[PDB]
């Protein structure tokens, strides 16, 4: 149908699969990512 | 600390007055107190200066600095 | 990301949400030095080192998989509506995990309010939708969509 | 330093933009397929009170 679609099909197959733990900000972010 | 008979090498930040008073404002987001929050944080300077000039002990400053280091990151985040 | 997981009719909500983000930027810029809003938008839309943003690409994706095959035009009202059940061709989209309210409209209450506001745009496609589509695509987005529609028509 | 480094960076960009030609500029889909999207700096300063940040004067008192 189009070359653009394939160019998009691959774009999705790249931002989905190709997608400091002792960090104060990181530790706080997770403690909050649970309440929601 | 002495009374804990070795059980505590220190007290967590939630038991620390400077952080207790500072975090309380950050947690409640109290509007009437938002312009005061830096003053409670300044208490660490008083204690730091005292540990360096009166108590003259390095470990006391090490611990104050380590507490500020932790608490200030939380301060910025919140 | 929300728009990429919804149909074409949700573009009105995207536009309203973007406008709230623009307002948030303005309010913050009075005290802070931030990247220009347009620069922030293009980066998030992946439209800086690329000719067509994510919005334009998703608009075309939806035209190809949803609008063309599933919608019925009513010339008297100038609106499109969805076809009957047996002709409704479903295509599963990957759901988007909702974030904290401040990353959307601000709060739970505001999220509900605006969600309802834009619910009046989900059951058809008309001038208001096209108006938004034009503004978000621009000349370059409209041109590529037209060129691509020609390819579709030629293919059929 | 930064000022000078940026100024020369600004100057040659002011020249590159001059050479831009809308008539010949061709667009390819490989940017959306084979080339990563632009990412602005995301540096966040933290741990501001490490010993290494202690100013010399206080270090001597220490």
């Amino acid at each position: 149908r189009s070359v653009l679609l394939e160019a998009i099909r691959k774009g999705i197959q790249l931002r989905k699969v190709e997608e400091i733990e002792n960090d104060v900000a990181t530790i706080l972010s997770r403690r909050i990512a649970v309440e929601y | 600390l002495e009374l804990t008979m070795g059980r505590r090498i220190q007290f967590p930040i939630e038991m620390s007055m400077p952080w207790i008073l500072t975090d309380h404002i950050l947690e409640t987001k109290e509007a009437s107190m938002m312009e005061y929050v830096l003053y409670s944080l300044d208490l660490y300077n008083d204690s730091a200066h005292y540990a360096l000039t009166r108590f003259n002990k390095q470990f006391l400053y090490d611990e104050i600095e380590a507490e500020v280091n932790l608490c200030f990151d939380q301060f910025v985040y919140k | 990301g929300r728009f990429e997981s919804e149909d074409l009719t949700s573009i009105v909500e995207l536009d309203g949400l973007l406008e709230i983000n623009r307002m948030t930027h303005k309010l913050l810029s009075r005290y802070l030095t931030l990247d220009g809003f347009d620069a922030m938008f293009r980066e998030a839309n992946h439209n800086v080192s690329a000719p067509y943003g994510r919005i334009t690409l998703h608009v075309f994706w939806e035209l190809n998989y949803d609008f063309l095959p599933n919608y019925c035009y009513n010339g008297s009202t100038n609106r499109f509506v969805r076809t009957v059940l047996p002709f409704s061709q479903e295509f599963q989209r990957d759901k988007q995990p909702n974030a904290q309210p401040q990353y959307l409209h601000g709060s739970k209450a505001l999220n509900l309010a605006y969600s309802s506001i834009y619910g009046s745009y989900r059951n058809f496609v008309g001038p208001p939708h096209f108006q938004v589509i034009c503004r978000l695509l621009g000349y370059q987005g409209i041109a590529v969509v037209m060129e691509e529609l020609l390819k579709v028509v030629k293919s059929l | 330093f930064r000022v000078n480094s940026l100024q020369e960076r600004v100057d040659r960009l002011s020249v590159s933009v001059t050479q831009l030609d809308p008539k010949e500029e061709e667009l390819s889909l490989q940017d959306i397929t084979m080339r990563k999207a632009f990412r602005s700096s995301t540096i966040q300063d933290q741990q501001l009170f490490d010993r290494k940040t202690l100013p010399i004067p206080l270090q001597e008192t220490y």
Side-chain angles (χ1 to χ4, degrees), chain A residues 6-29:
Chain A
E6 279 74 339
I8 301 179
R9 295 192 180 101
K10 300 303 178 182
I12 301 182
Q13 294 168 325
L14 254 59
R15 66 180 182 183
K16 182 180 181 61
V17 58
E18 188 70 38
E19 167 254 8
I20 41 181
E21 186 164 341
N22 286 326
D23 202 271
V24 172
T26 302
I27 298 176
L28 279 173
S29 297

Side-chain angles (χ1 to χ4, degrees), chain A residues 1-12 15-16 28-30 32-36, chain C residues 4 52 54 57-58 60-61 64-65 68 94 99-102 108 144 148 151-152 155-156:
Chain A
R1 287 261 279 260
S2 176
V3 129
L4 181 54
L5 285 181
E6 279 74 339
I8 301 179
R9 295 192 180 101
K10 300 303 178 182
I12 301 182
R15 66 180 182 183
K16 182 180 181 61
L28 279 173
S29 297
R30 298 182 178 180
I32 300 180
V34 45
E35 296 199 358
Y36 285 90
Chain C
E4 293 177 329
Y52 312 112
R54 298 163 59 181
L57 292 173
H58 184 60
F60 174 67
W61 181 275
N64 223 273
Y65 287 104
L68 296 186
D94 299 344
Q100 306 179 233
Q102 69 246 50
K108 292 303 193 307
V144 65
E148 289 300 324
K151 288 179 173 56
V152 176
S155 175
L156 292 176

Side-chain angles (χ1 to χ4, degrees), chain A residues 3-4 7 10 14 20 23, chain D residues 29 32-34 44 46-47:
Chain A
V3 129
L4 181 54
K10 300 303 178 182
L14 254 59
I20 41 181
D23 202 271
Chain D
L29 296 177
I32 312 178
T33 307
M34 306 270 70
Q44 291 191 10
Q46 52 192 356
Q47 294 286 277

Side-chain angles (χ1 to χ4, degrees), chain C residues 3 12 69:
Chain C
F3 177 61
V12 178

Side-chain angles (χ1 to χ4, degrees), chain D residues 10-55:
Chain D
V10 169
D11 284 330
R12 54 175 169 262
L13 180 56
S14 179
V15 171
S16 297
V17 175
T18 278
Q19 297 174 316
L20 285 174
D21 185 28
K23 184 179 181 180
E24 182 180 351
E25 177 166 335
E26 304 178 17
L27 287 55
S28 184
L29 296 177
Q30 55 187 358
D31 295 332
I32 312 178
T33 307
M34 306 270 70
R35 300 168 189 174
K36 58 179 58 181
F38 170 73
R39 297 277 179 256
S40 60
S41 176
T42 58
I43 298 302
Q44 291 191 10
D45 297 325
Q46 52 192 356
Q47 294 286 277
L48 291 66
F49 299 90
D50 295 329
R51 182 52 50 85
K52 45 187 175 62
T53 75
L54 184 62

Side-chain angles (χ1 to χ4, degrees), chain C residues 121-139:
Chain C
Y121 292 92
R122 305 305 304 272
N123 300 123
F124 78 95
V125 177
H129 301 83
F130 283 92
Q131 218 62 228
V132 172
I133 297 179
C134 280
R135 210 69 203 199
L136 294 182
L137 271 55
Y139 283 132

